[PDB]
Chains A and B, each alone.
With several copies, the nearest count.
Chain A
Amino acid sequence: LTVAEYLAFEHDYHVLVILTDMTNYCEALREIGAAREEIPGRRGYPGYMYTDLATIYERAGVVEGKKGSVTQIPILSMPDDDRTHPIPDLTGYITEGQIQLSRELHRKGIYPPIDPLPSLSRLMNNGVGKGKTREDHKQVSDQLYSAYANGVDIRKLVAIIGEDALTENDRRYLQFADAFERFFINQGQQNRSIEESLQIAWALLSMLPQGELKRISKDHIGKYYGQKLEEI
């Protein structure tokens, strides 16, 4: 982060910092703290772990009057997939959202196995739209989240009452969820442009009727709706 700050705020670089495993850092911190007879915290981690993590995470940002930037993507492995574990819990209290990988999606052979339902970017609303990526970005993202959540909870309902009792809309949302997981989330090693990703998102949304897209205004539906997923 010292190198990143130097580059960004003395040479106008846009720096992306990737911290490969903060879990290992927290174990090292627990070692160092417990070596000094300190009162342990929630699971033996030092009580000042929040402050120590903050002194790392808070160094990212943008400064008024300067062109550079520092962006951080910490990566941590949640022990036993418990998010209430002190490491992810304290990280979440400091960072501006989180991206959570899904073991179920990984089990189904999807890469990268990102689960959008528990994921969130707090600063997303101020960084998308006209003049930044393109106008319909926010509405498309909201509609994707709504439709995928509906597909997921309909899928959960299916396990109880069976598939034969669902309406046409629930079946369509199941198809949308399956296609979404297979094509939007599952992308392998492809380097997709934002325009390509929006194209795929709109193709997935076209599997739903126009009247189902409550999030999206009719102008963007007129502009972009009606593209077939059959195109590669």
Chain B
Amino acid sequence: PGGDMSEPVTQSTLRIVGAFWRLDASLAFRRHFPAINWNGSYSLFTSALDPWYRENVAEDYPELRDAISELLQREAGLQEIVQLVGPDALQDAERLVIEVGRIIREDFLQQNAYHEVDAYCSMKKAYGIMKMILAFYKEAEAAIKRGVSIDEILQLPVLERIGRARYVSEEEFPAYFEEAMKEIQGAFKALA
């Protein structure tokens, strides 16, 4: 009642369920869906499902998932400073963390339930999107470590490619993923 998560039913359910998917009113207001509050959510099944992920999705899938979670935790830590001094007062590495977190939220976490393609996502498609995002972040951190301005990294068209990778059909996705990986390598090769 009133969105108060401290109410008896929510607290009672908190003590017995294995996964807790907390929805956020602020995310729903800005039409960010599924509107899961990442900070308030958790799952207790992550460790037990790792062998299945290795056998069925990819051997390094848990490492990619942990990398994404670590990036989100770092972005959440930096947001406290951002809300104090603004995003432009950060260094280039921290600003890159902020922008990669925004990319993760808008291009990976977001999912349109009423879209003809984005409604369903396979495990391998999600793995490919995560791999593209992490490769882009690694290339961007390498470029930033040698003086490349962040303001021009964000203008690369591969950013839009990753952003629109959501709306690619399942059978067309592997070719799109290969092309996106090649473009990720090439664009950061071009930046000196």
A and B touch in the complex (CB under 8 A): yes
User: Using a CB–CB distance below 8 Å, which chain A residues touch chain B?
Assistant: 77, 79-80
CA distance in complex: A80, B15 (Å)? 12
B6 contacts across to A, CB distance below 8 A: 80
Could you count the A-B residue pairs with CB atoms below 8 Å apart for me: how many are there?
Answer: 4
How far, in Å, is B133 (CB) from chain A's closest CB?
22
How far, in Å, is A162 (CB) from chain B's closest CB?
16
User: Using a CB–CB distance below 8 Å, which chain B residues touch chain A?
Assistant: 6, 11, 15
Instruction: List 4 A-B pairs, Cβ < 8 Å.
Output: A77-B15, A79-B11, A80-B6, A80-B11
A80 contacts across to B, CB distance below 8 A: 6, 11
CA distance in complex: A80, B8 (Å)? 11
CB closest chain-A residue, reference B6: A80
CB closest chain-B residue, reference A77: B15
A79 contacts across to B, CB distance below 8 A: 11
CA distance in complex: A79, B11 (Å)? 9
CB closest chain-A residue, reference B11: A79
CB closest chain-B residue, reference A23: B15
CA distance in complex: A80, B14 (Å)? 12
CA distance in complex: A77, B11 (Å)? 12
CB closest chain-A residue, reference B8: A79
B15 contacts across to A, CB distance below 8 A: 77
A77 contacts across to B, CB distance below 8 A: 15
CA distance in complex: A77, B6 (Å)? 15
CB closest chain-A residue, reference B70: A109
CA distance in complex: A77, B16 (Å)? 13
CB closest chain-B residue, reference A80: B6
In the A-B complex, the 4 residue pairs with the smallest Cβ-Cβ separation, listed nearest first, are A80-B6, A79-B11, A77-B15, A80-B11
CA distance in complex: A80, B4 (Å)? 13
How far, in Å, is A88 (CB) from chain B's closest CB?
15
CA distance in complex: A77, B15 (Å)? 10
How far, in Å, is B8 (CB) from chain A's closest CB?
10
How far, in Å, is A188 (CB) from chain B's closest CB?
14
How far, in Å, is B81 (CB) from chain A's closest CB?
16
CA distance in complex: A77, B12 (Å)? 12
CB closest chain-B residue, reference A27: B12
CB closest chain-A residue, reference B5: A80
B11 contacts across to A, CB distance below 8 A: 79-80
CA distance in complex: A70, B43 (Å)? 36
CA distance in complex: A80, B6 (Å)? 8
How far, in Å, is A159 (CB) from chain B's closest CB?
13
How far, in Å, is A12 (CB) from chain B's closest CB?
38
How far, in Å, is B48 (CB) from chain A's closest CB?
17
CB closest chain-B residue, reference A21: B15
How far, in Å, is B72 (CB) from chain A's closest CB?
14
CB closest chain-A residue, reference B12: A27
How far, in Å, is B17 (CB) from chain A's closest CB?
15
CA distance in complex: A41, B8 (Å)? 18
How far, in Å, is B189 (CB) from chain A's closest CB?
35
CA distance in complex: A198, B88 (Å)? 48
How far, in Å, is A146 (CB) from chain B's closest CB?
31
